[PDB]
Design a protein around this motif. Structure first.
Motif, PDB file in Angstrom:
ATOM      1  N   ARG A  83     102.999   9.256   7.768  1.00  0.00           N
ATOM      2  CA  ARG A  83     102.580   7.936   7.302  1.00  0.00           C
ATOM      3  C   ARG A  83     102.618   7.845   5.777  1.00  0.00           C
ATOM      4  NH1 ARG A  83      97.393   7.190  10.090  1.00  0.00           N
ATOM      5  NH2 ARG A  83      96.557   9.295  10.460  1.00  0.00           N
TER       6      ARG A  83
ATOM      7  N   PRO B 233      93.396   9.631  13.502  1.00  0.00           N
ATOM      8  CA  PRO B 233      93.697   8.197  13.601  1.00  0.00           C
ATOM      9  C   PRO B 233      92.867   7.393  12.599  1.00  0.00           C
ATOM     10  CG  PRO B 233      92.452   8.989  15.516  1.00  0.00           C
ATOM     11  CD  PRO B 233      92.969  10.192  14.795  1.00  0.00           C
ATOM     12  N   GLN B 234      93.400   6.275  12.109  1.00  0.00           N
ATOM     13  CA  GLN B 234      92.762   5.505  11.036  1.00  0.00           C
ATOM     14  C   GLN B 234      91.302   5.153  11.314  1.00  0.00           C
TER      15      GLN B 234
HETATM   16 CL   LIG Z   1      96.398   5.503  13.247  1.00  0.00          CL
END
Ligand SMILES: [Cl-]
Ligand SMILES: C[S@@+](CC[C@H](N)C(=O)[O-])C[C@H]1O[C@@H](n2cnc3c(N)ncnc32)[C@H](O)[C@@H]1O
Ligand code: SF4
Ligand SMILES: [Cl-]
Ligand SMILES: [Cl-]
Ligand SMILES: [Cl-]
Ligand SMILES: [Cl-]
Length: 429
Positions: free
Chosen positions: A349, A311-312
């Motif tokens: 993404r 996750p970012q």
């Molecule tokens: Cl994310």
């Protein structure tokens, strides 16, 4: 003068010692903390203690030092690459992976020359210039002939600056064959440094051999390849032991050949298709950050690669704490860049998005390599990012403006790079 086996003995004794030290850590912890405040070098044992024990002071000062080191050597630079899966068929049968032979539930695909090259084209159009070829294990002659036709085809037909390779262990002759293909870095992950869990999780095929995989990088070196990559799958066994093992391994390489590993890849164990691996070691986010921190502070001039998708928010924290290489917009299945096949059950993404996010978190995205492997050097990274921006000027204009502005800011941040700034502004109209 030394042999790989020695490593396992060392990391074993250490792993024992540390555990004793685990029940009276106070004193030890204190001194370690002081060593972190002064910025002193740290030893294997104390690193082990640093990982094993979770206290506020210790973790905060550890992370602090990690960020300081990452900033001092790498700056705000994060290198981006895309993995190209050439084939998902394999001889072996590890409990944890989706590509294992006994799986049956997997669409088995090997890519033709045209397909692989087209994948390279699709990855290049994205803005990527660095590729990580990844395959399931086939016999040596098979894979090596396959690559002997595919890799030069990619180099010639596509604008790829670097092809890195994640191929199963080869013989000296095989590595001599690979060195002729002009690859950048050869990555081979030990997966686990504990023979007792290595035996446990690897069930069928040639990979079942511990030693054959352990000194694979040695053979790669002695066959003429100077850029190699270690790795250890986290969640397979006690994370402390694997962390110890990686550092011991890089140490060993440095002592034996005078050159250490270019990169250490740190992947946590992810959900797989039809995996049969039951027994687990849950790698907590905190402990993970501890691994990348300890790795950054122990092997400062050694790049750290984040192969697994995260996750970012955590991803860029890890970039803050030591990670120097990243997989962006990655496809984990063969033939998908154009376009269940995949190794991971992934919500693709876009590269432009994560570049946007990176640029907002103050990071410098790069597509260059030649980090510090030769032995700040921001210019090369600057211009790689410049080239990226110029390549996406029409795809996303606002991103082009944002990128230009960012580069301007970084350029004004350093007075030794005035003419570089002038040149950058010339290039971008
Ligand atoms: Cl994310
Ligand atoms: C697809 S293998 C390619 C290279 C070669 N087949 C080998 O085993 O070394 C790429 C890496 O993915 C990692 N991997 C496999 N299964 C995984 C899983 N379930 N979760 C996280 N990483 C995994 C392994 O560590 C492996 O080295
Ligand atoms: S872990 Fe690697 S060698 Fe083993 S089955 Fe999976 S892709 Fe093949
Ligand atoms: Cl690299
Ligand atoms: Cl990704
Ligand atoms: Cl894109
Ligand atoms: Cl846009």
């Amino acid at each position: 003068s030394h042999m790989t086996q020695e490593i396992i003995t060392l990391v074993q004794r250490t792993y024992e010692i540390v555990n004793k030290v685990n029940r009276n850590p106070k004193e030890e912890i204190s001194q370690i903390i002081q060593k972190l405040q002064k910025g002193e070098r740290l030893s294997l044992i104390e690193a082990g203690i640093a990982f094993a024990n979770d206290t506020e002071e210790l973790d905060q000062i550890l992370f602090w030092q990690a960020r300081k080191v990452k900033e001092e050597i790498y700056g705000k630079r994060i290198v981006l690459f895309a993995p190209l899966y050439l084939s998902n068929i394999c001889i072996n049968n590890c409990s944890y992976c989706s590509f294992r032979r006994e799986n049956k539930e997997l669409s088995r695909v090997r890519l033709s020359l045209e397909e692989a090259v087209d994948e390279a084209k699709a990855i290049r159009e994205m803005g990527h210039t660095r590729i990580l070829l990844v395959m399931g294990e086939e016999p040596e002659d098979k894979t090596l002939s396959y690559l002997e036709e595919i890799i030069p085809a990619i180099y010639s037909e596509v604008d790829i600056r670097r092809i890195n390779v994640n191929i199963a262990p080869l013989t000296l002759k095989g590595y001599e064959r690979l060195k002729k293909l002009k690859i950048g870095t050869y990555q081979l992950f030990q997966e686990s440094y504990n023979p007792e869990v290595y035996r446990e999780v690897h069930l069928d095929g040639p990979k079942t051999n511990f030693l054959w995989r352990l000194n694979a990088v040695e053979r790669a070196i002695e066959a003429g390849i100077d850029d190699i990559g270690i790795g250890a799958l986290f969640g397979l066994g006690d994370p402390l032991f694997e962390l110890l093992g990686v550092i011991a391994h890089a140490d060993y390489l440095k002592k034996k050949f005078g050159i250490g590993p270019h990169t250490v890849s740190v992947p946590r164990l992810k959900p797989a298709l039809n995996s049969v691996f039951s027994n687990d070691y849950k790698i907590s986010d905190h402990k993970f950050k501890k691994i990348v921190a300890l790795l950054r502070i122990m092997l400062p001039y050694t790049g750290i690669i984040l192969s697994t998708r995260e996750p970012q928010h955590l991803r860029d924290e890890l970039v803050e704490l030591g990670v120097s290489q990243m997989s962006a917009a990655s496809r984990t299945g063969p033939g998908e860049y154009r376009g269940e096949r995949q190794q991971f059950l992934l919500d693709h993404r876009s590269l432009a998005e994560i570049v946007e996010v990176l640029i907002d978190k103050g990071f410098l995205p790069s597509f260059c390599t030649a980090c510090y492997r030769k032995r700040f050097c921001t210019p090369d990274a600057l211009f790689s990012f410049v080239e990226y921006l110029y390549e996406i000027r029409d795809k996303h204009p606002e991103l082009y403006k944002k990128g230009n502005g960012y580069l301007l800011q970084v350029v004004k941040d350093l007075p030794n790079f005035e003419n570089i700034g002038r040149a950058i502004e010339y290039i971008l109209k």
